[PDB]
Amino acid sequence: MDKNELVQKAKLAEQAERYDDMAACMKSVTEQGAELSNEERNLLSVAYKNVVGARRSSWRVVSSIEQKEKKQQMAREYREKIETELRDICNDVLSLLEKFLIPNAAESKVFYLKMKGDYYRYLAEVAAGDDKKGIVDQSQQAYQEAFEISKKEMIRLGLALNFSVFYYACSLAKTAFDEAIAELLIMQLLRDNLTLW
Amino acid sequence: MDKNELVQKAKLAEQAERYDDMAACMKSVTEQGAELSNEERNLLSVAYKNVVGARRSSWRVVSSIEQKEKKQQMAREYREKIETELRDICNDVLSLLEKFLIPNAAESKVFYLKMKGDYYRYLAEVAAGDDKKGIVDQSQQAYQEAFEISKKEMIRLGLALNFSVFYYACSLAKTAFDEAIAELLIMQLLRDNLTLW
């Protein structure tokens, strides 16, 4: 396939901004013989996040507008479409993780398992019925799994942020952020998130 | 088809940033029975402009990257693609233009004819052999048509700007602005462009 050409292809794509292209080359690379060289590993997260997050954004706004009837049938209609593009990415990557990444790793374990909880979390926001539950739980047992592989050889602090804000707590953000002070964007971020909650 | 629902749809799309969704919605409105109400007329040019605009940016970076060999086929190959994606937009807007828009026009006549010149100018940047010439002149005589209505019920000054970059001139861009300073963003823009040439 030429893994290192798919890699040097995604890079080009990122420099050219086309993220759906980048996430594509990086998915091809990931489903080869894994172990994603540090550049590749980030390239994966950077491409997929530019993609997913975009829909996460669209979905946010079109939903704000769906709430504030027919202008809502037409808004539910669109939101249903932007939720699909979204679900398709989270599934696309979720598989990559559980199926090739998380089971092929030390630090990278919590980097990935954080990402598993992350995308599942995006699926939870967007979920529906009991579906909602089965998913939001899966977000926890992944975040909490990376969390447990934190007090180890330590991404870690970054997890705190996500996982903490997954609960919505502020408590957990201090703790993380408190153990970070005795180590003396990431640090201020959850300090900042405490101004909120 | 519900022209106004297609219209309400593109105001939504753009608000959600999905510009391809916008151009799509606005293209439908324009290929109805025209005389695109002013709100529609810019909405159309804001959608299509972010779209082809995106491609021109990508084309610029990828083309530069492509010059600085196998990594070059890899990039000539990628450029090849962005170009195809970009030629389908110009062809796409040029038809609305010449076959629905420009013939169903006061001041709009210059706005549109300018747009014709623009999108032909884009194909001129991207074209290759003897194709290049046919395109660049087709752009000239469109710019040149709108250019002569410049001197009518007058966009016109913004036309001067574009039409001036079309020659690369520094002449017309002074002239455009000379007279603009006997009328006392756009105005600084062509002055500023004289600080480059």
UniProtKB/Swiss-Prot annotation, chains A, B:
Disulfide bonds: none
One biological process term in Gene Ontology: regulation of programmed cell death
Signal peptide per UniProt: none
PTM comment: The delta, brain-specific form differs from the zeta form in being phosphorylated. Phosphorylated on Ser-58 by PKA and protein kinase C delta type catalytic subunit in a sphingosine-dependent fashion. Phosphorylation on Ser-58 by PKA; disrupts homodimerization and heterodimerization with YHAE and TP53.
UniProt keyword annotations, A-Z: Acetylation, Cytoplasm, Phosphoprotein
Gene Ontology MF: a single term: DNA-binding transcription factor binding
Similarity section: Belongs to the 14-3-3 family.
Described purpose of this protein according to its UniProt entry: Adapter protein implicated in the regulation of a large spectrum of both general and specialized signaling pathways. Binds to a large number of partners, usually by recognition of a phosphoserine or phosphothreonine motif. Binding generally results in the modulation of the activity of the binding partner. Promotes cytosolic retention and inactivation of TFEB transcription factor by binding to phosphorylated TFEB. Induces ARHGEF7 activity on RAC1 as well as lamellipodia and membrane ruffle formation. In neurons, regulates spine maturation through the modulation of ARHGEF7 activity.
Subunit organization: Homodimer. Heterodimerizes with YWHAE. Homo- and heterodimerization is inhibited by phosphorylation on Ser-58. Interacts with FOXO4, NOXA1, SSH1 ARHGEF2, CDK16 and BSPRY. Interacts with WEE1 (C-terminal). Interacts with MLF1 (phosphorylated form); the interaction retains it in the cytoplasm. Interacts with BAX; the interaction occurs in the cytoplasm. Under stress conditions, MAPK8-mediated phosphorylation releases BAX to mitochondria. Interacts with TP53; the interaction enhances p53 transcriptional activity.
Protein name per UniProt: 14-3-3 protein zeta/delta
Protein's organism: Bos taurus (Bovine)
